[PDB]
Amino acid sequence: VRPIHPGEVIADILDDLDINTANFAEILGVSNQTIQEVINGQRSITVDIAIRLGKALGNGPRLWLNLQQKVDLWYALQSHKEEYEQVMTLV
């Protein structure tokens, strides 16, 4: 059970709305690239992006920041787990 990336939620919204990333980027006032990077999980939601999402969709920024924080923590914990398993592993 990996966390749901904000980008995955966005992609699903755009799919339901039958609009593309460029159309949505235009609405938000950011570049297509920036939206596509979020969708592809290459770029994190910033406060600025959360605010724009919140206004455009009418669901507020916190939903989006919460999504991103959960992702951030999951990757931090994964990383920590790997790091320590490695330290603890004998060759």
Backbone as a chain_set.jsonl record, in Angstrom:
{"seq": "VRPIHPGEVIADILDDLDINTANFAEILGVSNQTIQEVINGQRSITVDIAIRLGKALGNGPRLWLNLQQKVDLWYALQSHKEEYEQVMTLV", "coords": {"N": [[0.847, -1.223, 0.0], [1.35, 1.612, -1.192], [1.638, 5.168, -0.895], [-0.833, 7.421, -2.224], [0.118, 9.451, -4.801], [0.016, 12.959, -5.274], [-0.006, 13.613, -7.963], [-1.159, 11.454, -9.191], [-3.734, 11.693, -8.44], [-4.422, 14.08, -9.622], [-4.111, 13.336, -12.364], [-6.186, 11.546, -12.64], [-8.406, 13.194, -12.148], [-8.211, 14.834, -14.422], [-8.711, 13.061, -16.328], [-11.333, 12.264, -15.809], [-12.56, 14.707, -16.362], [-12.046, 15.076, -18.962], [-10.009, 16.698, -19.987], [-6.792, 18.076, -20.905], [-3.285, 18.147, -19.882], [-2.129, 20.537, -20.57], [-4.334, 22.28, -20.779], [-5.138, 22.283, -18.193], [-2.985, 23.318, -16.923], [-3.048, 25.866, -17.905], [-5.323, 26.883, -16.691], [-4.482, 26.862, -14.017], [-2.333, 28.583, -14.06], [0.313, 27.852, -14.35], [3.132, 26.209, -15.938], [2.762, 23.751, -18.585], [4.659, 21.771, -18.458], [5.334, 21.821, -15.753], [3.005, 20.843, -14.566], [2.919, 18.358, -15.741], [5.153, 17.204, -14.664], [4.453, 16.986, -12.018], [2.361, 15.195, -12.2], [3.735, 12.986, -13.106], [5.165, 12.268, -10.982], [7.636, 13.374, -10.572], [8.034, 15.888, -9.525], [7.399, 17.657, -6.614], [4.4, 18.779, -4.965], [4.262, 22.174, -4.346], [3.638, 24.849, -1.905], [2.609, 26.983, -3.311], [1.598, 25.629, -5.691], [-0.297, 23.987, -4.473], [-2.08, 25.943, -3.471], [-3.034, 26.981, -5.881], [-4.293, 24.722, -6.993], [-6.192, 24.301, -5.077], [-7.788, 26.584, -5.326], [-8.647, 26.449, -8.021], [-10.011, 24.025, -8.149], [-11.655, 24.06, -6.024], [-11.321, 22.914, -3.513], [-9.442, 23.592, -1.662], [-6.081, 24.119, -0.243], [-4.989, 22.346, 1.603], [-5.67, 19.691, 1.4], [-4.133, 18.851, -0.716], [-1.467, 19.428, 0.084], [-1.425, 17.683, 2.193], [-1.603, 15.213, 0.93], [0.924, 15.283, -0.392], [2.657, 15.444, 1.822], [2.3, 12.986, 2.957], [3.307, 11.254, 1.049], [5.987, 12.149, 1.088], [6.8, 11.415, 3.597], [6.546, 8.664, 3.416], [8.468, 7.93, 1.563], [10.656, 8.798, 2.995], [10.693, 7.154, 5.122], [10.975, 4.729, 3.875], [13.448, 4.981, 2.918], [14.933, 5.106, 5.066], [14.626, 2.707, 6.088], [15.777, 0.982, 4.266], [18.373, 1.953, 4.476], [19.177, 1.29, 6.979], [18.756, -1.438, 7.13], [20.714, -2.124, 5.404], [23.023, -1.312, 6.822], [22.966, -3.127, 8.726], [23.261, -5.536, 7.619], [25.195, -8.386, 7.058], [27.949, -9.379, 5.107]], "CA": [[0.0, 0.0, 0.0], [2.121, 2.848, -1.391], [0.799, 6.348, -0.837], [-1.361, 8.016, -3.471], [0.856, 10.711, -5.18], [-0.865, 14.036, -5.771], [-0.02, 13.549, -9.407], [-2.079, 10.398, -9.589], [-5.077, 12.243, -8.216], [-4.585, 15.052, -10.703], [-4.288, 12.618, -13.658], [-7.534, 10.951, -12.578], [-9.328, 14.332, -12.322], [-8.153, 15.35, -15.795], [-9.32, 11.964, -17.12], [-12.746, 12.374, -15.635], [-12.991, 15.988, -16.947], [-11.742, 15.061, -20.403], [-9.122, 17.798, -20.373], [-5.41, 17.672, -20.905], [-2.394, 18.791, -18.902], [-1.946, 21.954, -21.017], [-5.583, 22.967, -20.471], [-5.227, 22.436, -16.736], [-1.865, 24.25, -16.577], [-3.522, 27.192, -18.283], [-6.243, 27.251, -15.608], [-3.752, 27.094, -12.766], [-1.325, 29.626, -14.273], [1.68, 27.294, -14.338], [3.44, 25.626, -17.241], [2.357, 22.378, -18.858], [5.763, 20.974, -17.963], [5.251, 21.775, -14.288], [1.886, 19.947, -14.248], [3.237, 17.013, -16.166], [6.159, 16.705, -13.708], [3.711, 16.587, -10.791], [1.62, 13.987, -12.592], [4.691, 11.872, -13.32], [5.811, 12.056, -9.693], [8.987, 13.966, -10.617], [8.03, 17.163, -8.877], [6.488, 17.756, -5.475], [3.474, 19.92, -4.768], [4.672, 23.265, -3.509], [2.509, 25.577, -1.35], [2.042, 27.724, -4.468], [0.791, 24.701, -6.505], [-1.465, 23.595, -3.616], [-3.005, 27.078, -3.485], [-3.671, 27.054, -7.194], [-5.171, 23.552, -7.062], [-7.251, 24.545, -4.099], [-8.696, 27.61, -5.902], [-9.211, 25.983, -9.296], [-10.882, 22.852, -7.914], [-12.52, 24.444, -4.883], [-11.112, 22.01, -2.393], [-8.471, 24.118, -0.695], [-4.727, 23.629, -0.41], [-4.508, 21.405, 2.589], [-5.883, 18.329, 0.822], [-3.005, 18.642, -1.641], [-0.277, 19.399, 0.927], [-1.515, 16.432, 3.009], [-1.195, 14.178, -0.053], [2.338, 15.379, -0.634], [3.366, 15.132, 3.064], [2.213, 11.502, 3.156], [4.304, 10.743, 0.11], [7.33, 12.542, 1.546], [7.108, 10.59, 4.769], [6.662, 7.264, 2.99], [9.777, 7.798, 0.947], [11.709, 9.02, 3.994], [10.688, 5.917, 5.953], [11.481, 3.656, 3.022], [14.842, 5.24, 2.681], [15.539, 4.887, 6.371], [14.53, 1.249, 6.293], [16.825, 0.482, 3.375], [19.673, 2.442, 4.926], [19.513, 0.565, 8.215], [18.87, -2.847, 6.761], [22.054, -2.207, 4.79], [24.038, -1.181, 7.84], [22.807, -4.298, 9.613], [23.451, -6.743, 6.817], [26.557, -8.914, 7.001], [28.327, -10.003, 3.819]], "C": [[0.876, 1.265, 0.0], [1.145, 4.008, -1.323], [0.314, 6.743, -2.213], [-0.651, 9.343, -3.692], [-0.218, 11.69, -5.586], [-1.058, 13.975, -7.269], [-1.007, 12.536, -9.946], [-3.515, 10.884, -9.459], [-5.397, 13.242, -9.305], [-4.898, 14.338, -12.033], [-5.718, 12.074, -13.762], [-8.6, 12.035, -12.795], [-9.376, 14.72, -13.807], [-8.866, 14.32, -16.682], [-10.848, 12.036, -17.02], [-13.304, 13.609, -16.373], [-12.803, 16.009, -18.453], [-11.016, 16.348, -20.787], [-7.668, 17.333, -20.252], [-4.58, 18.515, -19.954], [-2.21, 20.247, -19.276], [-3.132, 22.842, -20.658], [-5.582, 23.26, -18.967], [-4.146, 23.404, -16.273], [-2.278, 25.693, -16.846], [-4.447, 27.738, -17.182], [-5.483, 27.658, -14.367], [-2.785, 28.234, -12.854], [0.071, 29.113, -13.978], [1.931, 26.647, -15.703], [2.9, 24.206, -17.345], [3.384, 21.432, -18.269], [5.62, 20.744, -16.47], [4.144, 20.784, -13.888], [2.254, 18.524, -14.607], [4.246, 16.378, -15.205], [5.502, 16.263, -12.425], [3.003, 15.267, -11.056], [2.515, 12.78, -12.612], [5.463, 11.548, -12.053], [7.265, 12.482, -9.655], [9.157, 15.289, -9.874], [7.008, 17.112, -7.747], [5.546, 18.93, -5.612], [4.138, 20.95, -3.857], [3.429, 23.955, -2.882], [1.813, 26.346, -2.45], [1.115, 26.828, -5.343], [-0.442, 24.239, -5.767], [-2.515, 24.695, -3.566], [-3.757, 27.174, -4.773], [-4.691, 25.917, -7.407], [-6.401, 23.792, -6.256], [-8.272, 25.512, -4.703], [-9.392, 27.08, -7.129], [-10.258, 24.917, -9.101], [-11.907, 23.08, -6.835], [-12.471, 23.525, -3.721], [-10.001, 22.414, -1.429], [-7.095, 23.464, -0.813], [-4.309, 22.489, 0.465], [-4.59, 19.987, 2.108], [-4.619, 17.898, 0.045], [-1.657, 18.517, -0.886], [-0.252, 18.115, 1.747], [-1.104, 15.258, 2.152], [0.33, 14.131, -0.206], [3.099, 14.984, 0.648], [3.399, 13.642, 3.278], [3.182, 10.777, 2.268], [5.727, 10.949, 0.625], [7.739, 11.625, 2.683], [7.345, 9.151, 4.343], [8.037, 7.014, 2.4], [10.883, 7.972, 1.983], [11.842, 7.721, 4.774], [11.255, 4.759, 5.167], [12.979, 3.75, 2.975], [15.568, 4.811, 3.95], [15.646, 3.398, 6.551], [15.626, 0.553, 5.503], [18.218, 0.753, 3.945], [20.111, 1.549, 6.094], [19.591, -0.92, 8.015], [20.261, -3.079, 6.19], [23.175, -2.194, 5.851], [24.132, -2.465, 8.637], [23.063, -5.627, 8.913], [24.914, -7.131, 6.739], [26.757, -9.564, 5.636], [29.172, -11.229, 4.048]], "O": [[1.104, 1.889, 1.036], [-0.033, 3.859, -1.649], [0.947, 6.451, -3.228], [-0.787, 10.263, -2.885], [-1.235, 11.313, -6.168], [-2.143, 14.252, -7.781], [-1.61, 12.724, -11.003], [-4.387, 10.536, -10.255], [-6.502, 13.256, -9.847], [-5.843, 14.704, -12.732], [-6.359, 12.136, -14.812], [-9.569, 11.828, -13.526], [-10.453, 14.908, -14.372], [-9.533, 14.672, -17.655], [-11.556, 11.889, -18.016], [-14.394, 13.552, -16.941], [-13.349, 16.874, -19.139], [-11.357, 17.001, -21.774], [-7.365, 16.34, -19.591], [-5.069, 19.447, -19.316], [-2.14, 21.107, -18.398], [-2.964, 24.003, -20.284], [-5.975, 24.343, -18.531], [-4.354, 24.202, -15.359], [-1.908, 26.611, -16.114], [-4.354, 28.904, -16.799], [-5.794, 28.669, -13.737], [-2.432, 28.816, -11.829], [0.909, 29.831, -13.43], [1.018, 26.557, -16.524], [2.62, 23.549, -16.342], [3.037, 20.42, -17.659], [5.764, 19.624, -15.982], [4.331, 19.98, -12.975], [1.942, 17.589, -13.869], [4.206, 15.172, -14.96], [5.925, 15.288, -11.805], [3.043, 14.347, -10.239], [2.126, 11.69, -12.195], [6.315, 10.659, -12.047], [8.037, 12.018, -8.816], [10.274, 15.744, -9.63], [5.904, 16.592, -7.907], [5.841, 19.926, -6.272], [4.527, 20.635, -2.733], [2.302, 23.672, -3.286], [0.585, 26.367, -2.525], [0.001, 27.226, -5.684], [-1.514, 24.11, -6.358], [-3.712, 24.411, -3.614], [-4.964, 27.416, -4.787], [-5.787, 26.129, -7.926], [-7.518, 23.521, -6.694], [-9.478, 25.287, -4.603], [-10.604, 27.239, -7.271], [-11.274, 24.896, -9.796], [-12.909, 22.37, -6.75], [-13.459, 23.359, -3.007], [-9.664, 21.675, -0.504], [-6.955, 22.393, -1.405], [-3.39, 21.742, 0.132], [-3.702, 19.173, 2.365], [-4.136, 16.771, 0.146], [-0.84, 17.641, -1.171], [0.808, 17.53, 1.969], [-0.34, 14.399, 2.594], [0.937, 13.062, -0.153], [4.091, 14.259, 0.565], [4.404, 13.091, 3.727], [3.809, 9.8, 2.679], [6.554, 10.037, 0.597], [8.864, 11.127, 2.732], [8.249, 8.491, 4.856], [8.687, 6.013, 2.702], [11.942, 7.356, 1.861], [12.946, 7.25, 5.05], [11.939, 3.9, 5.723], [13.689, 2.745, 2.991], [16.656, 4.237, 3.909], [16.625, 2.887, 7.094], [16.308, -0.341, 6.003], [19.108, -0.096, 3.9], [21.261, 1.118, 6.173], [20.398, -1.597, 8.652], [20.899, -4.097, 6.458], [24.134, -2.962, 5.775], [25.186, -2.844, 9.146], [23.077, -6.689, 9.534], [25.769, -6.313, 6.399], [25.859, -10.207, 5.092], [29.583, -11.883, 3.09]]}, "num_chains": 1, "name": "protein.A"}
